[PDB]
């Protein structure tokens, strides 16, 4: 990771968690002083965040809107189907799926700790554990570039409804079983159904701003 | 467009057209001298090309492989379906589809001129004319970031088979009619069928390297 990428990750986590609010301003000099970093690094960090849709170029934290949320979910669900179908076709031995079981345990541990921040962080390891099965650089880079925006929406859904962690775990368990069963019709059903549900929960939160 | 983006577009067109070959080296100083540009601009231009999958960081033009070609087509077909379905649902008056008819004429004009380079260039205006219907920044930026790689593969298919221009036009006409008919099942059929056909033509060319 370049220093620009480290700074962007730091600011992205603050936007994702709701610590930096919609329309809030980010000043280059304030970030340089708080983090003890070079100004050029901060400038590049903001360009990364803009590329990842989290800020508008100083910079201002981007606003959420229903059309962009719906846009994001319509796209990410098709990318997740592609990833999950590649795991379902390519896994050869059940040992290769063990990463998903460890993530299941990590999600449960964060739920036990009432840790929404860690729950979101661990959710993204699911995609990361799928990448070696797909060996698809275009898909991987696309998903990685969208993870901050997805994170931000997903975090808002959990801020609105803690029981969504229980809901996600139930759907994830169904997805894992469908991948184990190599059932592509069921994989698409689970992802499309949970995707629409989670999107509408984000929209409910947006409507209450 | 920044100067870095202009330089990257210039080098991308040379890779897309086959003027810069797989594994060929690009030297920063050679580009600065040929184009009369700043070295920092060229350095950033290469980072753009690497982000767009056209070079590995000097830099070397990336190699094509069957798994990456299949990866690219599996992804881009789902993105095209998303775009085409949004046009099919959102167009209100047939005047709004006129851009696609003009592109049809431009494709025919390049075919008449035996201009594969211009045919590829005009093909990408189809996606660009679809963006206002989708109003989907995530989808738009994803497609824009993949257009150079798609371009390169598509250009190789036409270098292998000029009659593919006639084939593309026939399929495009069917897609436009399905969009006019707001028939989403037919939209997916046309894009999936042409996608698999064009992908296998690229694979045929790869096998003959």
Author numbering:
A (entry chain A), B (entry chain A): 7 to 63, 68 to 219
The authors write:
The asymmetric unit of the structure comprises a dimer of AlkR, with each monomer featuring an N‐terminal DNA binding domain (residues 1–71) and a C‐terminal effector binding domain (residues 76–219). The DNA binding domain of AlkR protein is characterized by the presence of two β‐strands (β1 and β2) and three α‐helices (α1 to α3). The helix–turn–helix motif, formed by α2 and α3, is linked to the anti‐parallel β‐strands (β1 and β2) via a small loop (wing motif). The C‐terminal domain contributes to the secondary structure of AlkR protein with six additional helices (α4 to α9), which are indicative of AlkR protein classification within the VanR‐group regulators belonging to the FCD subfamily of the GntR superfamily. A chemical cross‐linking assay with sulfo‐EGS showed that AlkR protein is predominantly in the dimer form in solution, consistent with the results of size exclusion chromatography. In this work, the Apo‐form structure of AlkR dimers revealed that the Arg45 and Arg49 are involved in interactions with the major groove of DNA, by forming hydrogen bonds with specific DNA bases. This interaction is likely pivotal for the recognition and binding of AlkR protein to its specific DNA motif, and removal of the side chains of arginine resulted in the decreased DNA affinity of AlkR protein. Moreover, a flexible sequence (specifically at residues 64–67) in the N‐terminal of AlkR is also important for its DNA binding, predominantly interacting with the minor groove of the DNA helix. Specifically, residues I63 and G68 in AlkR protein are situated on the linker of the flexible minor groove insertion sequence, potentially acting as a scaffold of this region for stabilization by hydrogen bonding via their side chains. The structural modeling results of AlkR protein and C18‐CoA using AutoDock revealed that C18‐CoA was surrounded by the C‐terminal effector‐binding domain of AlkR protein composed of helices α4‒α9.
